RNA sequence: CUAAAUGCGGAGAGAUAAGUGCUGAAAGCAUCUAAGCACGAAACUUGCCCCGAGAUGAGUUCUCCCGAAGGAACGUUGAAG
RNA sequence: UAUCGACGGCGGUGUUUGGCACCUCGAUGUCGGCUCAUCACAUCCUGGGGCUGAAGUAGGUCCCAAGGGUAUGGCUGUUC
RNA sequence: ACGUCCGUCGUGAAGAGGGAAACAACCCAGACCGCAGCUAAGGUCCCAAAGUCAUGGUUAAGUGGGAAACGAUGUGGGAAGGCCCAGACAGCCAGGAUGUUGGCUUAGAAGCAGCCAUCAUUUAAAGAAAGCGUAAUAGCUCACUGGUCGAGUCGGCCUGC
């Protein structure tokens, strides 16, 4: 059993195998069904199976993590700061598709997963904030993915790449 | 393979020889090998030269078992000529519980790393013994 | 046009006839069309001045017997065959003047210097 | 009829490998995994074209014999053989 | 230890060769080619990758891949 | 070379029946007729006739059967050395120095190609230095010590799959 205290600005309710967390940023519903009973105490969320088998603890580590992740994502949320760079031809990054990359004719794009905001001001910094984590971390990773020289041209010579400043 | 020697024809020479270490005092250490096996003179040199080239710290390294069992081969057709002595030179007979290399040394083992290097040259799983 | 064929010269390098050897960038059962550069070895020419009769050089086919169809639907056919010798200088005739007409697709898109010396264009 | 003749012959979508990453344990650190998850090959399935009920799930449809609501045979010719 | 890589040791394949005669010599006439029909993969370029004596460039070696394409002559009956 | 010639075993011989999927030799067990009962081979959940039978355990691989020289903190079990709650052994934080770029050698090597030494200094610790790294330096770790962390940790031998 690994008791997990909940912040003063966090309210979680559990009904069966469904656990919903409420707060300011928003709400997140997740399901945890295994050989364990997850109950919520007036001041702490408890998680403790009956057996102590390896597979029983492995699921206990991820569970506590997922829960802790749902808490921060409602109090602070998820947001990644990215910046574009280019020595020569300025890469015009739009909310739709980036253009003039390294001087290439056709633009490079990537479908925006889930529903997160990626407002990019006319400057060098951009922001990709959202509710889900596996989403805000993917869209930010893919944004750099395409910025990666496809041809057999090593780095160093091609600085043009929009890397993420902070995680 | 019925144990052999010579009293026949002279073959190649010994790829071994350098006993190494000083023999002014006789000890009772060693490196036993679990399992019987035939080791050729060449492989014996590689293993011996392996540890000796590592135990530069000191000496007292010795070997008790030596190759004394020849083995002939026969390349080509067949019908005239028992067997000649080629690459297959003398071979030593190791017993399931026989000590090969023993180094006169008090608990300061700096050759265990050497015996390990040699233990990877002879075809047989050997074990380190203190007694 | 295939290998071991005899075609006439169009330039004035001192050569009269030419014996087609093979084509550059073409592996087929004997072939050498107009516009395709092919290494050859002239037969009749001036054995002096500069070893001509016997040497192997490169040339570009200009006219052939085979009839080629145009976008309109009409086919054009010539008498024999002709070619123009070229030197090492990336696509450059060795002679001074060229005799005989030329095609259109052999101008703009491809050669721009050979047309400047072309006294006729069909 | 043919030919050295002419007209026509996708893109895209989905799932993976190598590999690139996310979240996250076993080792409260770390980690692409071990459960889960986002992407990722001219190859895979399909799409498309051709053959095809002796495809044993060996089909279907309507109408034709249920005392008559047709059909086989026949005659003159083939965009048929 | 970044191509090359001796001595020695340990293996895989069986395309090569020598070849222990239970199978066929009451006989599946011989090599190679040719022509014709049917059923597969330990590959050179291109494509995707590993190592690098891979700084870059240009190369070396190795893995993967058939998708397409392997269409020709002179001497010799000759097969390589 | 699809042997000559010995040895052991086993079959073809003179062998049922029967299982092993099929089978010359592996296991068990030996033929009159018709018939009754009970056992052996083997099988016993269903087709299939016979218990989805008893006690205990393992594997989880569906392994259920080719598989090797070689590698492995996948996991379980056992023995043995050292360090352990008068703050260490490992984490985290910061040091890790001075003569000296030790001498020699080397185009260059100044802890870290190689050749020999390996002392001294300030001092809680700091080897003229165990590794990565440079053309050579530089840079980054370790050894050693302090603070914090507060607990199982570390080297090693053997056995099962």
XYZ file of C-alpha atoms (C1' of nucleotides) in Angstrom:
742
model
C 0.000 0.000 0.000
C 1.404 3.362 -1.091
C -0.740 6.267 0.217
C -0.704 9.327 -2.050
C -1.759 12.609 -0.441
C -3.747 15.038 -2.591
C -3.126 18.823 -2.771
C -5.575 21.320 -1.270
C -6.570 22.434 -4.753
C -7.278 18.913 -5.984
C -10.479 16.871 -5.730
C -10.544 13.253 -6.899
C -13.486 10.844 -6.994
C -13.414 7.113 -7.736
C -16.311 4.895 -8.821
C -15.244 1.320 -9.504
C -12.273 1.218 -11.865
C -12.656 4.844 -12.942
C -10.699 7.645 -11.266
C -11.507 11.285 -12.025
C -9.337 14.208 -10.921
C -10.726 17.748 -10.740
C -9.076 21.126 -10.257
C -8.431 24.432 -12.013
C -6.717 23.585 -15.304
C -9.283 20.894 -16.042
C -10.339 17.297 -15.435
C -8.801 13.949 -16.377
C -10.515 10.556 -16.257
C -8.366 7.417 -16.252
C -9.033 3.706 -15.740
C -6.879 1.374 -13.642
C -8.153 -2.212 -13.644
C -5.870 -4.876 -12.163
C -5.440 -7.225 -9.201
C -5.699 -4.231 -6.869
C -8.414 -2.084 -5.290
C -7.929 1.674 -5.618
C -9.876 3.660 -3.022
C -9.913 7.364 -2.160
C -9.653 8.542 1.444
C -10.849 11.954 2.634
C -7.211 13.068 2.453
C -5.250 10.403 0.561
C -5.612 8.013 -2.378
C -4.687 4.468 -1.348
C -3.270 1.689 -3.532
C -2.240 -1.664 -2.094
C -2.903 -5.182 -3.485
C -2.928 -8.358 -1.389
C 0.035 -10.181 -2.923
C 3.566 -8.846 -3.254
C 4.572 -10.475 -6.533
C 6.917 -8.641 -8.906
C 4.172 -7.988 -11.457
C 2.145 -6.672 -8.537
C 4.684 -3.984 -7.679
C 5.473 -3.091 -11.291
C 1.834 -2.078 -11.722
C 2.041 -0.233 -8.403
C 4.894 1.957 -9.591
C 3.158 3.022 -12.793
C -0.152 3.555 -10.993
C 1.349 5.958 -8.457
C 3.114 7.744 -11.313
C 0.006 8.071 -13.481
C -1.914 9.443 -10.499
C 0.828 11.934 -9.643
C 0.855 12.897 -13.321
C -2.885 13.585 -13.272
C -2.395 15.875 -10.274
C 0.303 18.113 -11.753
C -1.555 18.228 -15.059
C -4.523 19.831 -13.316
C -2.696 22.226 -10.993
C 0.108 23.369 -13.303
C -0.617 21.594 -16.574
C 1.720 20.761 -19.473
C 3.490 23.266 -21.719
C 6.638 23.112 -23.847
C 8.557 26.146 -25.099
C 10.109 25.686 -28.543
C 12.209 28.043 -30.664
C 13.000 28.069 -34.382
C 16.426 28.819 -35.861
C 17.814 29.182 -39.371
C 21.064 30.552 -40.778
C 20.163 31.891 -44.209
C 16.528 31.371 -45.179
C 14.110 32.163 -42.351
C 11.758 29.230 -41.783
C 8.205 30.580 -41.643
C 6.443 28.488 -39.002
C 2.660 28.842 -39.188
C -0.148 27.255 -37.200
C -0.735 25.139 -40.296
C 2.519 24.226 -42.045
C 6.104 25.503 -41.966
C 7.625 26.819 -45.196
C 10.929 27.921 -46.725
C 12.844 25.343 -44.686
C 16.520 25.392 -45.683
C 15.233 26.949 -48.891
C 13.126 23.982 -49.981
C 10.141 24.618 -52.254
C 7.442 22.447 -50.673
C 6.543 22.852 -46.963
C 6.721 20.164 -44.272
C 3.766 19.421 -41.993
C 2.368 17.055 -39.364
C -1.242 16.543 -38.269
C -2.030 17.997 -34.843
C -3.082 15.136 -32.504
C -5.832 15.438 -29.887
C -6.877 18.983 -29.041
C -4.051 21.178 -27.766
C -3.209 24.808 -28.539
C 0.001 25.516 -30.451
C -0.216 29.301 -30.748
C 2.978 30.580 -32.366
C 3.671 34.344 -32.172
C 5.551 36.121 -34.964
C 8.970 35.754 -33.336
C 11.398 33.038 -32.228
C 9.365 31.395 -29.459
C 6.281 29.179 -29.676
C 4.118 27.337 -27.142
C 2.296 23.999 -27.225
C 0.066 23.672 -24.161
C -2.636 21.082 -23.552
C -4.416 18.841 -21.055
C -3.085 15.432 -22.094
C 0.622 14.699 -21.605
C 1.284 11.973 -24.180
C -0.071 14.476 -26.707
C 1.780 17.678 -25.815
C 4.974 15.640 -25.730
C 4.412 13.997 -29.104
C 3.419 17.044 -31.155
C 6.510 18.775 -29.768
C 8.734 15.823 -30.666
C 7.340 15.473 -34.186
C 7.794 19.198 -34.797
C 11.534 18.584 -34.479
C 11.331 15.235 -36.273
C 10.502 16.792 -39.642
C 13.046 19.531 -38.939
C 15.578 16.696 -39.070
C 17.448 16.525 -42.421
C 15.888 13.625 -44.329
C 18.668 13.390 -46.958
C 22.063 11.892 -46.114
C 23.319 15.260 -44.879
C 24.866 15.257 -41.417
C 24.129 17.909 -38.805
C 26.395 20.765 -37.769
C 26.204 22.245 -41.261
C 22.412 22.483 -41.063
C 21.549 24.569 -38.002
C 17.965 25.062 -39.187
C 15.975 23.207 -36.529
C 13.282 24.145 -34.013
C 14.406 22.570 -30.734
C 12.466 22.733 -27.464
C 13.869 25.142 -24.873
C 12.244 23.784 -21.712
C 10.502 20.474 -21.015
C 42.576 -43.423 -27.415
C 45.195 -45.888 -26.101
C 47.881 -43.737 -24.471
C 50.879 -43.263 -26.767
C 54.486 -42.058 -26.887
C 57.187 -42.908 -29.434
C 59.750 -45.715 -29.736
C 58.774 -45.117 -33.349
C 59.816 -42.036 -35.326
C 60.984 -38.567 -34.285
C 58.411 -35.815 -34.810
C 58.282 -32.047 -34.274
C 59.673 -30.220 -31.252
C 58.158 -28.789 -28.077
C 56.172 -25.579 -28.514
C 56.462 -25.407 -24.729
C 59.481 -25.365 -22.433
C 59.896 -22.294 -20.232
C 58.818 -23.669 -16.854
C 59.167 -20.153 -15.432
C 59.395 -19.215 -11.769
C 62.029 -20.196 -9.216
C 62.089 -23.713 -7.768
C 64.071 -23.269 -4.553
C 60.934 -23.938 -2.513
C 58.207 -26.462 -3.337
C 54.623 -25.380 -2.724
C 51.194 -27.000 -2.926
C 48.839 -24.609 -4.731
C 47.329 -24.963 -8.190
C 44.460 -24.594 -10.640
C 42.329 -27.741 -10.883
C 40.122 -28.521 -13.880
C 36.881 -30.475 -13.482
C 36.834 -32.975 -16.333
C 39.216 -35.173 -18.314
C 40.575 -33.868 -21.602
C 43.480 -34.010 -24.041
C 45.404 -30.760 -24.507
C 47.976 -30.314 -27.279
C 51.394 -28.767 -26.630
C 50.493 -25.660 -28.637
C 47.388 -24.781 -26.622
C 49.483 -25.411 -23.509
C 51.958 -22.763 -24.655
C 49.218 -20.223 -25.357
C 47.756 -20.706 -21.878
C 51.134 -20.783 -20.131
C 52.467 -17.803 -22.086
C 49.198 -16.027 -21.288
C 49.609 -16.056 -17.506
C 53.398 -15.681 -17.549
C 52.888 -12.570 -19.678
C 50.540 -11.267 -16.985
C 52.317 -12.314 -13.787
C 55.135 -9.844 -14.440
C 54.654 -8.806 -10.811
C 56.552 -11.891 -9.644
C 56.969 -15.560 -10.518
C 56.811 -18.951 -8.807
C 54.455 -20.074 -11.578
C 54.783 -23.747 -12.519
C 53.144 -26.572 -14.466
C 53.081 -30.265 -13.540
C 51.345 -31.909 -16.502
C 53.126 -32.022 -19.866
C 52.300 -33.473 -23.321
C 53.648 -37.012 -23.726
C 51.004 -38.639 -25.930
C 51.613 -38.245 -29.700
C 48.814 -38.334 -32.287
C 49.314 -38.926 -36.017
C 47.116 -37.839 -38.929
C 46.706 -38.885 -42.563
C 45.968 -36.517 -45.506
C 44.969 -37.909 -48.967
C 43.744 -41.328 -50.227
C 44.633 -44.392 -48.077
C 46.354 -47.794 -48.444
C 50.025 -47.435 -47.441
C 51.334 -45.528 -44.430
C 49.941 -45.904 -40.906
C 50.219 -42.290 -39.783
C 52.658 -39.381 -39.818
C 53.255 -36.754 -37.148
C 51.828 -33.468 -38.407
C 50.194 -30.524 -36.625
C 48.910 -33.014 -34.053
C 51.938 -33.076 -31.749
C 52.205 -34.361 -28.169
C 49.064 -34.153 -26.032
C 48.720 -34.124 -22.243
C 46.186 -36.227 -20.340
C 44.280 -34.271 -17.694
C 42.274 -36.045 -14.993
C 38.869 -34.859 -13.671
C 40.703 -33.648 -10.581
C 44.257 -32.851 -11.648
C 46.216 -29.686 -10.881
C 47.887 -28.133 -13.922
C 49.295 -24.684 -13.164
C 50.307 -23.913 -9.579
C 51.954 -20.679 -8.443
C 53.751 -20.474 -5.099
C 51.921 -17.506 -3.613
C 50.438 -16.505 -0.262
C 46.986 -14.792 -0.306
C 48.009 -11.945 -2.621
C 46.514 -13.453 -5.773
C 47.491 -11.222 -8.679
C 47.619 -14.157 -11.080
C 43.934 -15.040 -10.753
C 43.542 -12.567 -13.607
C 46.283 -14.445 -15.449
C 44.795 -17.888 -14.830
C 41.526 -16.421 -16.101
C 43.126 -15.368 -19.386
C 44.590 -18.852 -19.794
C 41.364 -20.499 -18.634
C 39.874 -19.137 -21.856
C 42.469 -20.819 -24.072
C 42.222 -24.472 -23.032
C 39.098 -26.465 -24.040
C 37.818 -27.287 -20.546
C 35.987 -25.434 -17.768
C 38.650 -24.897 -15.109
C 38.186 -23.556 -11.579
C 40.439 -21.561 -9.255
C 41.618 -23.334 -6.102
C 43.379 -21.834 -3.080
C 44.462 -25.100 -1.453
C 21.636 2.196 -87.023
C 23.603 -0.627 -85.413
C 27.220 -1.623 -84.802
C 29.606 -2.069 -87.740
C 27.434 0.233 -89.862
C 28.728 2.773 -92.381
C 27.458 6.355 -92.222
C 28.598 9.632 -93.790
C 30.181 12.576 -91.966
C 28.541 15.988 -91.563
C 31.524 18.004 -90.326
C 34.831 18.887 -91.990
C 37.511 17.108 -89.968
C 38.966 15.384 -93.011
C 36.821 12.271 -92.669
C 34.417 10.975 -95.317
C 32.737 7.807 -94.049
C 32.319 6.381 -90.549
C 31.933 2.882 -89.112
C 29.620 2.896 -86.093
C 31.096 1.024 -83.135
C 28.679 1.277 -80.203
C 26.456 3.676 -78.256
C 26.972 5.350 -74.874
C 24.276 4.408 -72.381
C 22.343 1.891 -74.442
C 22.352 -1.893 -74.102
C 20.104 -3.323 -76.818
C 20.258 -5.637 -79.835
C 22.163 -3.186 -82.039
C 21.004 0.449 -82.011
C 21.988 4.103 -82.409
C 19.338 6.754 -83.007
C 19.520 10.470 -83.771
C 20.833 12.512 -80.860
C 22.624 9.560 -79.281
C 26.377 10.002 -78.859
C 28.370 7.007 -80.089
C 32.076 6.169 -80.202
C 33.237 5.219 -83.696
C 36.250 4.674 -85.946
C 36.199 6.508 -89.283
C 37.160 4.482 -92.353
C 37.839 6.813 -95.287
C 39.713 10.063 -94.629
C 43.131 11.740 -94.758
C 45.812 9.306 -93.443
C 48.130 12.274 -92.854
C 48.363 15.584 -91.019
C 46.946 14.066 -87.850
C 46.426 10.299 -87.625
C 42.777 10.248 -88.688
C 42.116 6.989 -90.544
C 42.136 4.453 -87.725
C 41.538 6.540 -84.607
C 38.413 6.098 -82.491
C 36.420 9.180 -81.487
C 32.898 10.196 -80.471
C 30.080 11.458 -82.692
C 26.425 12.508 -82.652
C 23.875 11.059 -85.075
C 21.928 13.706 -86.995
C 20.180 11.892 -89.852
C 19.068 8.277 -90.286
C 17.081 6.060 -92.653
C 14.486 5.040 -90.066
C 11.389 7.222 -90.124
C 10.376 9.049 -86.955
C 6.810 10.208 -86.309
C 5.996 13.710 -85.067
C 3.186 14.955 -82.761
C 1.122 15.888 -85.826
C 1.295 12.359 -87.205
C 3.659 12.789 -90.149
C 6.774 10.640 -90.533
C 10.119 11.870 -91.870
C 12.644 9.701 -93.720
C 16.116 10.413 -95.101
C 18.385 8.698 -97.629
C 21.421 7.312 -95.838
C 22.913 8.181 -92.461
C 25.151 10.937 -91.098
C 26.885 12.032 -87.894
C 29.070 14.775 -86.419
C 32.424 14.130 -84.742
C 33.034 15.708 -81.335
C 36.130 16.202 -79.180
C 36.800 15.939 -75.443
C 35.470 19.452 -74.828
C 32.032 18.557 -73.437
C 29.895 18.165 -76.563
C 31.842 20.198 -79.127
C 32.258 19.447 -82.868
C 35.847 19.096 -84.086
C 35.068 20.466 -87.537
C 34.168 24.057 -88.380
C 31.024 23.876 -90.517
C 28.218 21.304 -90.511
C 26.365 19.967 -93.558
C 22.747 18.834 -93.461
C 19.539 19.874 -91.624
C 18.677 19.080 -88.003
C 15.675 18.337 -85.786
C 13.925 20.670 -83.341
C 14.119 18.705 -80.086
C 17.872 18.716 -80.713
C 18.015 22.454 -80.020
C 16.509 24.393 -77.099
C 16.194 21.637 -74.483
C 19.500 19.958 -75.356
C 22.202 21.503 -77.557
C 22.275 25.281 -77.982
C 25.619 25.541 -79.779
C 24.998 22.921 -82.468
C 21.918 24.866 -83.572
C 23.906 28.095 -83.914
C 25.920 26.321 -86.615
C 22.941 24.507 -88.145
C 22.388 25.818 -91.716
C 18.967 24.144 -91.843
C 16.149 23.200 -89.466
C 13.084 21.081 -90.241
C -6.080 -7.863 -90.433
C -1.953 -6.143 -89.000
C 3.003 -2.840 -88.034
C 8.730 0.327 -87.457
C 0.898 3.343 -85.675
C -2.385 5.355 -82.171
C -5.503 6.188 -77.264
C -5.180 4.364 -71.900
C -2.239 2.077 -67.516
C -3.198 6.587 -59.634
C -3.134 8.936 -55.706
C -4.490 7.823 -51.264
C -5.807 4.980 -46.805
C -4.638 1.050 -42.929
C -1.251 -2.221 -40.107
C 4.276 -3.518 -38.987
C 9.977 -4.449 -39.408
C 14.941 -1.693 -38.816
C 14.816 2.611 -36.427
C 13.328 7.410 -33.937
C 10.465 8.885 -29.382
C 6.492 9.308 -25.242
C 4.839 7.797 -20.417
C 6.802 4.301 -16.814
C 8.466 0.359 -13.539
C 11.636 -4.108 -11.758
C 16.848 -1.183 -8.937
C 12.014 5.172 -4.479
C 17.659 7.405 -9.756
C 17.843 6.163 -14.643
C 15.654 3.517 -18.859
C 11.747 3.125 -25.822
C 8.888 -1.848 -22.185
C 9.033 -5.506 -19.229
C 2.112 -3.769 -19.311
C 0.546 0.569 -22.238
C 1.304 4.335 -26.216
C 2.626 8.194 -30.680
C 5.193 7.688 -35.354
C 7.899 4.882 -38.808
C 9.580 0.707 -45.385
C 9.063 0.519 -53.379
C 7.279 -4.993 -48.885
C 1.766 -6.956 -46.483
C -4.131 -6.460 -47.066
C -7.438 -3.740 -49.890
C -8.487 -0.617 -53.720
C -8.104 -1.650 -59.667
C -8.151 -5.122 -63.993
C -8.664 -10.440 -65.766
C -10.735 -15.785 -64.811
C -14.360 -17.805 -62.364
C -20.042 -22.232 -59.665
C -17.033 -29.359 -60.459
C -16.108 -22.332 -55.209
C -19.388 -29.217 -51.479
C -21.390 -22.654 -48.163
C -21.049 -27.138 -56.266
C -25.246 -19.787 -56.315
C -28.998 -16.552 -57.648
C -33.283 -14.413 -60.320
C -37.800 -14.355 -62.886
C -40.746 -16.795 -65.703
C -41.675 -21.979 -67.946
C -44.401 -28.732 -66.348
C -48.346 -28.135 -60.660
C -53.699 -30.487 -66.929
C -51.995 -26.365 -68.848
C -49.847 -18.984 -67.475
C -44.020 -22.454 -71.540
C -40.105 -24.934 -73.377
C -36.916 -28.479 -76.511
C -37.196 -29.861 -81.927
C -38.002 -26.774 -86.806
C -37.316 -22.684 -90.743
C -34.298 -18.103 -92.532
C -29.402 -15.754 -90.952
C -25.283 -13.846 -87.586
C -22.347 -8.355 -83.829
C -21.434 -16.627 -82.542
C -18.805 -20.718 -83.629
C 41.449 -3.517 -32.527
C 40.235 2.440 -37.385
C 41.459 -1.355 -43.921
C 45.428 -5.594 -43.527
C 46.178 -9.429 -40.219
C 50.742 -14.295 -39.013
C 51.157 -18.520 -35.188
C 47.498 -21.320 -32.675
C 42.613 -22.893 -31.267
C 37.209 -23.635 -32.111
C 33.120 -24.224 -35.995
C 29.531 -23.893 -40.330
C 28.452 -25.090 -45.494
C 29.202 -29.136 -48.743
C 29.254 -25.392 -54.771
C 35.296 -28.278 -55.137
C 38.223 -32.532 -54.764
C 39.973 -37.410 -52.788
C 37.009 -40.088 -52.671
C 35.393 -46.141 -47.075
C 31.185 -50.011 -53.079
C 24.633 -51.485 -48.516
C 21.402 -48.571 -53.681
C 21.012 -48.918 -60.100
C 25.733 -52.037 -64.474
C 18.569 -58.712 -65.411
C 22.067 -51.252 -67.759
C 17.961 -43.744 -64.302
C 23.653 -44.307 -73.057
C 28.410 -39.684 -71.335
C 30.157 -33.860 -70.678
C 28.527 -28.793 -72.316
C 25.536 -26.216 -75.226
C 20.711 -25.827 -77.683
C 15.681 -25.683 -77.744
C 10.833 -26.048 -74.289
C 7.513 -26.342 -69.803
C 7.296 -26.075 -64.239
C 8.856 -24.951 -58.838
C 13.228 -21.212 -55.616
C 17.285 -17.843 -53.283
C 23.536 -17.451 -48.713
C 23.458 -11.181 -55.051
C 26.958 -6.135 -58.806
C 24.170 -0.984 -59.541
C 20.004 1.662 -57.564
C 16.985 1.710 -52.352
C 17.240 1.052 -46.808
C 21.303 -0.013 -43.078
C 26.181 -1.849 -39.832
C 31.879 -0.989 -39.286
C 35.298 2.388 -40.774
C 42.661 3.121 -41.716
C 34.276 6.966 -41.320
C 37.267 14.714 -40.124
C 34.837 16.386 -45.240
C 35.024 14.232 -50.112
C 36.113 9.919 -52.365
C 36.547 4.789 -51.174
C 37.064 -0.450 -48.433
C 34.190 -4.438 -46.170
C 29.586 -6.470 -44.608
C 23.877 -7.027 -44.115
C 19.409 -6.383 -46.590
C 16.706 -6.303 -51.157
C 14.592 -9.002 -57.029
C 11.066 -4.447 -57.911
C 12.704 -4.038 -62.833
C 16.635 -5.508 -66.336
C 21.067 -9.647 -67.490
C 19.306 -8.082 -75.044
C 25.099 -9.362 -78.173
C 30.308 -11.379 -81.299
C 35.717 -13.662 -83.521
C 39.204 -18.836 -82.897
C 37.943 -24.036 -80.923
C 33.015 -29.539 -81.291
C 34.821 -28.397 -76.655
C 32.365 -27.209 -70.825
C 34.614 -23.826 -66.857
C 34.782 -46.382 -52.567
C 27.494 -48.746 -51.358
C 34.836 -53.369 -47.530
C 38.338 -57.059 -45.935
C 38.593 -58.576 -40.646
C 37.633 -58.731 -35.104
C 34.511 -57.223 -30.628
C 29.544 -55.907 -28.132
C 24.522 -55.563 -29.083
C 20.506 -56.010 -32.033
C 17.823 -57.559 -35.282
C 16.830 -60.487 -41.457
C 16.759 -65.696 -39.431
C 12.335 -69.070 -36.273
C 7.872 -64.967 -33.613
C 2.494 -63.734 -32.636
C -0.183 -60.216 -29.964
C 0.959 -54.582 -28.777
C 2.496 -49.573 -27.924
C 5.720 -46.451 -29.510
C 1.531 -41.671 -34.896
C 3.469 -45.086 -39.260
C 8.454 -49.027 -38.448
C 13.035 -55.444 -38.303
C 15.150 -54.958 -33.838
C 13.044 -49.539 -27.833
C 9.464 -51.266 -23.672
C 6.052 -55.489 -22.126
C 4.777 -60.042 -23.323
C 4.338 -65.277 -26.398
C -0.780 -68.176 -30.596
C -6.043 -74.887 -30.861
C -11.502 -74.100 -31.111
C -16.035 -71.588 -29.244
C -16.818 -69.198 -24.903
C -16.545 -66.532 -19.590
C -13.514 -63.641 -16.250
C -9.251 -61.122 -15.058
C -4.515 -58.795 -16.308
C -0.156 -57.404 -19.623
C 1.210 -53.774 -24.433
C -0.674 -49.403 -24.472
C -4.315 -46.461 -23.475
C -8.084 -44.581 -20.046
C -11.765 -36.049 -21.538
C -14.263 -36.624 -26.552
C -14.197 -39.407 -31.737
C -12.500 -44.460 -28.765
C -13.763 -48.972 -25.513
C -11.813 -47.518 -20.151
C -11.064 -42.329 -13.876
C -11.639 -35.365 -17.361
C -8.679 -41.062 -10.771
C -5.332 -40.223 -5.708
C -0.819 -37.524 -3.160
C 3.129 -33.911 -4.163
C 5.850 -30.707 -7.170
C 7.633 -27.996 -11.489
C 7.145 -25.234 -15.875
C 3.871 -21.171 -18.159
C 7.300 -22.165 -21.891
C 2.008 -24.553 -25.274
C 7.464 -25.354 -23.719
C 5.171 -30.092 -25.399
C 10.559 -31.568 -28.179
C 17.186 -31.297 -33.204
C 20.495 -28.425 -31.620
C 26.086 -26.857 -30.675
C 31.718 -24.150 -29.310
C 30.128 -19.271 -26.961
C 27.167 -15.024 -23.810
C 23.528 -13.570 -19.913
C 21.944 -8.790 -12.386
C 15.470 -13.634 -16.513
C 14.634 -15.860 -12.105
C 14.902 -19.282 -7.789
C 18.002 -21.899 -4.076
C 22.635 -22.788 -1.073
C 27.623 -21.925 1.155
C 31.692 -18.481 2.147
C 35.037 -12.861 2.849
C 34.700 -7.916 4.006
C 32.192 -3.424 5.305
C 27.120 -1.905 8.703
C 23.061 2.158 12.531
C 29.775 5.518 18.474
C 26.279 8.117 10.771
C 29.902 3.616 7.010
C 29.419 0.651 2.319
C 26.625 2.836 -2.179
C 23.441 7.560 -3.803
C 23.144 13.549 -3.903
C 26.270 18.246 -3.159
C 31.623 20.118 -3.482
C 36.556 19.055 -3.623
C 40.164 15.758 -6.042
C 45.255 20.104 -5.260
C 51.424 22.532 -5.053
C 56.995 21.877 -7.062
C 55.803 19.024 -11.830
C 54.539 20.144 -18.714
C 59.085 13.929 -12.785
C 63.186 12.221 -15.725
C 64.137 10.014 -20.399
C 62.376 9.497 -25.046
C 59.551 11.573 -28.746
C 57.734 15.751 -34.652
C 54.502 16.156 -29.981
C 53.021 12.949 -25.247
C 52.460 18.171 -19.946
C 48.584 11.337 -14.700
C 46.855 8.423 -19.051
C 52.388 5.678 -26.713
C 56.648 3.693 -24.730
C 61.115 3.467 -21.341
C 62.366 3.893 -15.406
C 61.144 5.708 -10.961
C 56.498 6.866 -8.293
C 59.306 10.476 -3.542
C 58.027 15.388 -1.391
C 54.353 19.515 -0.406
C 49.490 21.866 2.135
C 47.438 19.325 4.984
C 40.061 16.205 6.494
C 41.294 13.795 1.264
C 43.914 14.118 -3.381
C 47.692 7.778 -6.329
C 53.458 12.521 -9.895
C 47.524 9.415 -10.614
C 42.891 3.538 -12.090
C 39.600 5.063 -17.114
C 37.127 8.303 -21.193
C 39.095 12.132 -24.123
C 43.197 15.697 -27.397
C 47.673 16.073 -32.884
C 49.771 17.590 -28.047
C 47.000 20.626 -24.129
C 42.147 21.342 -22.422
C 37.781 18.993 -20.534
C 35.065 14.861 -17.929
C 35.216 10.683 -13.975
C 37.732 7.273 -10.269
C 40.938 6.465 -6.009
C 40.785 9.374 -0.940
C 37.922 12.855 2.582
C 33.711 16.074 4.525
C 28.231 17.079 4.566
C 23.820 15.141 3.583
C 21.166 10.442 2.521
C 19.787 6.140 7.238
C 19.936 0.982 5.157
C 20.550 -3.367 3.608
C 24.991 -3.218 0.581
C 29.423 -5.215 -1.657
C 33.284 -8.941 -3.614
C 33.064 -14.141 -4.281
C 31.858 -20.030 -4.941
C 28.240 -23.694 -6.410
C 23.634 -25.683 -8.233
C 18.434 -25.904 -11.219
C 15.846 -24.340 -15.857
